[PDB]
Write a protein that binds this ligand. Structure first.
Ligand SMILES: CC[C@H]1OC(=O)[C@H](C)[C@@H](OC(=O)N2CCC[C@@H]2c2cccnc2)[C@H](C)[C@@H](O[C@@H]2O[C@H](C)C[C@H](N(C)C)[C@H]2O)[C@](C)(OC)C[C@@H](C)C(=O)[C@H](C)[C@H]2NC(=O)O[C@@]21C
Ligand SMILES: [Mg+2]
Ligand SMILES: [Mg+2]
Lengths: 58, 113, 117, 127
RNA sequence: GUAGGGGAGCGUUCAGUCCGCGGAGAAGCCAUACCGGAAGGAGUGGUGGAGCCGACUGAAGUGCGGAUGCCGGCAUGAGUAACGAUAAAAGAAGUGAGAAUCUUCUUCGCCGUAAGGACAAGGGUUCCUGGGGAAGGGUCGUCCGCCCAGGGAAAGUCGG
RNA sequence: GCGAGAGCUAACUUCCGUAGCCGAGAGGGAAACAACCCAGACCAUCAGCUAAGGUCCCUAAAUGAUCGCUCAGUGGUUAA
RNA sequence: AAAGGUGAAAAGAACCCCGGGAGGGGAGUGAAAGAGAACCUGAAACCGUGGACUUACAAGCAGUCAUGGCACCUUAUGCG
RNA sequence: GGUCAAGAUAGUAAGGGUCCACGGUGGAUGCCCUGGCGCUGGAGCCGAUGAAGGACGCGAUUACCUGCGAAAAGCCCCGA
């Protein structure tokens, strides 16, 4: 058949313990020096399209 | 280990096709939006292309034609762009990071000259 | 007429599943395992009733020879003294005296020493 | 008080700052990951975090949060710069069961799990 | 005290009889620290929203943890293996709530005794247009062979 | 266990005789341990006495009394 | 094969708000919407959010008995 | 009060556990009947005047069922 197979159901406890590292880390959001919508460090502000001057359209 | 120093993600032929492909795009358009990595690999190949063109002689032209298979882009690079870069000690390529895509979730970037 | 289980089983099941309190995992949630656990709990229940009675006397004796030895004696000897002083038939209570009333415990040590030597 | 019959005519049941996205074609655990970063955060932070979390559950979640906001303001009089995600949770909707073919003749079932994404806005108030 | 024999009873549906209860809240469900020697039984509260308890007597499709038992729902493995030929893909422009994936332009690459083209069998409207965007599409779709409506198929000589 | 055959006066062996236990027997002891040793559980108690077994600490109870033995850790791996 | 059930009556929710939609929140109808068209009740497995007491020197058929700590007070204050 | 030493002890929860509250899932249970089963009795052959059973139709709009049959969800006569 399907050669190595689990021997016993993994308990609600054991299953959950394994998920103690699955939690997403929230982005470190910065506020744009211009358009004043929040942005990602080292990226162009989505809203105004600025990164010192304006690079992207809108 | 692997202390080499280059970067592919396809087969020999393809790595060269992509390089030349995007190099023609940037040189023709002046600014292209692509994947970050893809853009990173492009930066030196295109930067090296400008230096060849910065020769001005037929050989320098013919050398560019080995990578740029567009009759017009080769003229744009030879006669227009390379001369404008005359006193720039190499460096005209800048990469800005735009931000994550929907499908693959890939972080996009801009590359302009 | 037909006479389906309806209500009888679920009630039978909820009774068991409520004896299952601080029962770990499936032992408190699924009937078959909750019930199964209880069979073994029954063994422990009936046994621990007559066991506590050995358990306590043990604790009782331990406190006695502790105090008996505080006044240069021991349980073996002390008890024989109280036995030899037929008058003395504390047995039950005797541990609390050692633990709470040291003045009183000493008196009984001194009486036990007499009835002996 | 009176009795139940009366109460039902007297007090008619409100859901302040509550909004639910029901039967969302996405797996609960997958959706919970996003919702988990939004819990307890100020409705404005919530709106912003969502725009930058690269998971596809971000869109549906965001949509509930804006609905909960609207509801808090319009239907409940509540004041905005006081708003926050009091509660948020994902419950499972009905599973869409589909049959996938496998090697040597056998078949399997793919579970296409759905979600009930509910978020509850409240006014903070330090005092 | 096992097989086994003997005794006394608890509970379920239906029935005949009597006593009743119920929209000022029946059954069922949910909680509980109360009662009985046990099966069990009651009080209070919560839900429900139209039927029902008690007593005697009668009859049974009358009591489940097991049967690799049957039907159904839901877990575990686990956010794991995989996403179906190693013939590539790139940028621009467009559309749209939304675009790696839809349209268009310029390139690139794979087949080319085929991976092109014409029948036959077989399938049945899949064809074309305009719309759609649940589900199907191994991802995503604004798109499709999917969904909706309208249209399209023409023989004295070709097959019968 | 005792009394025999078979078997190597082997087997947690086999086949009889005979008693007891387990089978269907809980409790104490024998570390653990159906059978050995003690003892046959109607229920309750935060009372008492004893059996076999024990009384340095783990672990309940004399690191008890007297006259001796062994010095090999014998005790706590068998013979010519 | 499996599949039954709004409400007494469709009075089947005009209008508003977030959303492309789906879905919801209101307003209104109704005794009730704790009946809203995935429409009687709505067990259990199973998946969650919140609170109490807790757990990062531990060897485990997961209980059982005993004691201490914390919490609570609607058959319920010596009783749990 | 402060420095040094010697001890002892608390709190942290990435995540888990038990209990409680509130939910989601699911469709048991109760109530219901629009559907079945049995027994009792009645009734008991249809067709070349074309059956049983069907195909294709018939609608302003018609996929499905019903009824019908180019006189086509119906035509004529009698009765209620
Ligand atoms: C390739 C997949 C194919 O397996 C095989 O063919 C291998 C080779 C075969 O090996 C074999 O049959 N053999 C024959 C001897 C060599 C090879 C073998 C045996 C053991 C291990 N590995 C290989 C088995 C291992 C064999 O089992 C073996 O049977 C033996 C009778 C006893 C073994 N025991 C002791 C463990 C057992 O494993 C059986 C009988 O199959 C055919 C197992 C049964 C369950 C079976 O039918 C599967 C559904 C089988 N059919 C299918 O479509 O898929 C399977 C899994
Ligand atoms: Mg079973
Ligand atoms: Mg000898």
């Amino acid at each position: 058949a399907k050669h190595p197979v689990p021997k016993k159901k993994t308990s609600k406890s054991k299953r959950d313990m394994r998920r103690s590292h699955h939690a997403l880390t929230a982005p470190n959001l910065t506020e744009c020096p211009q358009c004043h919508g929040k942005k990602l460090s080292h990226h162009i502000c989505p809203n105004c399209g600025y990164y010192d001057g304006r690079q992207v359209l809108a | 280990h692997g202390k080499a120093g280059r970067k592919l993600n396809r087969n020999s032929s393809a790595r060269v096709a992509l390089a030349r492909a995007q190099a023609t795009a940037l040189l023709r358009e002046g600014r292209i939006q692509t994947t970050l990595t893809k853009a990173k690999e492009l930066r030196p190949f295109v930067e090296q292309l400008i230096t060849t063109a910065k020769g001005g002689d037929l050989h320098s032209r013919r050398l560019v034609a080995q990578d740029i298979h567009d009759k017009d882009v080769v003229r744009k690079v030879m006669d227009e762009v390379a001369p404008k870069y005359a006193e720039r000690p190499g460096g005209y390529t800048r990469i800005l990071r735009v931000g994550t895509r929907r499908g693959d979730g890939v972080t996009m970037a801009l590359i302009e000259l | 007429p037909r006479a389906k289980t309806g209500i009888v089983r679920r009630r039978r099941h909820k009774k068991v599943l409520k004896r299952a309190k601080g029962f770990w995992g499936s032992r408190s949630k699924q009937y078959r395992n909750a019930f199964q656990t209880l069979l073994n709990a029954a063994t422990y229940e009936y046994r621990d009733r007559r066991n506590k009675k050995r358990d306590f006397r043990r604790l009782w004796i331990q406190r006695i020879n502790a105090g008996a030895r505080l006044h240069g004696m021991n349980y073996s000897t002390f008890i024989n003294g109280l036995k030899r002083a037929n008058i003395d038939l504390n047995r039950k209570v005797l541990a609390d005296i050692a633990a709470r009333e040291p003045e009183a415990f000493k008196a009984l040590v001194d009486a036990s020493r007499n009835a002996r030597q | 008080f009176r009795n139940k019959k009366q109460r039902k005519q007297q007090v008619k049941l409100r859901k302040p700052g509550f909004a639910v996205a029901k039967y969302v074609r996405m797996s609960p655990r997958k959706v919970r990951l996003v919702v988990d970063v939004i819990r307890g955060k100020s409705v404005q932070d919530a709106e912003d975090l969502l725009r930058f979390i690269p998971r596809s559950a971000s869109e549906p979640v965001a949509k509930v949060l804006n609905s909960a906001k609207a509801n808090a303001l319009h239907n409940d009089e509540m004041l905005e710069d006081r708003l926050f995600v009091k509660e948020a949770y994902v419950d499972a909707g009905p599973t869409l069961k589909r049959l996938i073919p496998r090697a040597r003749g056998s078949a399997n079932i793919i579970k296409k799990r759905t979600s009930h994404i509910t978020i509850i806005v409240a006014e903070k108030g330090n005092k």
